[PDB]
Amino acid sequence: MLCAISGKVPRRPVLSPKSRTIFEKSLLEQYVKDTGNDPITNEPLSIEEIVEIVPS
């Protein structure tokens, strides 16, 4: 329930199908323009496969 990039309480809670944690969209955007990797599995590219946790 805390981000795998930096552990911040998210403003845009976001998941990637490989890592399966919940990170902040903004902190993933940093990591995924750095290397593209998922923060845990290091699978190249993340945001092109993003699951944003909408309030709906």
**Joined tokens for residue 30:** 């940093």
Instruction: Give one word for 55, left, alpha or beta, with left for phi > 0 and alpha for psi -120 to 50.
Output: alpha
Is the Cβ–Cβ distance between 10 and 3 less than 8 Å? Answer: yes
**Joined tokens for residue 36:** 């593209």
Way it was determined? NMR
CATH code, residues 1-56: 3.30.40.10
β-partners of residue 13 are 24
β-partners of residue 46 are none
Cα separation, 51 vs 14, in Å, equals 6
Length of the chain: 56
The angle at the Cα of 14, spanning 48 to 25, to the nearest 5 degrees, equals 75
**Joined tokens for residue 31:** 């990591």
Domain map of the chain by residue range? 1-56
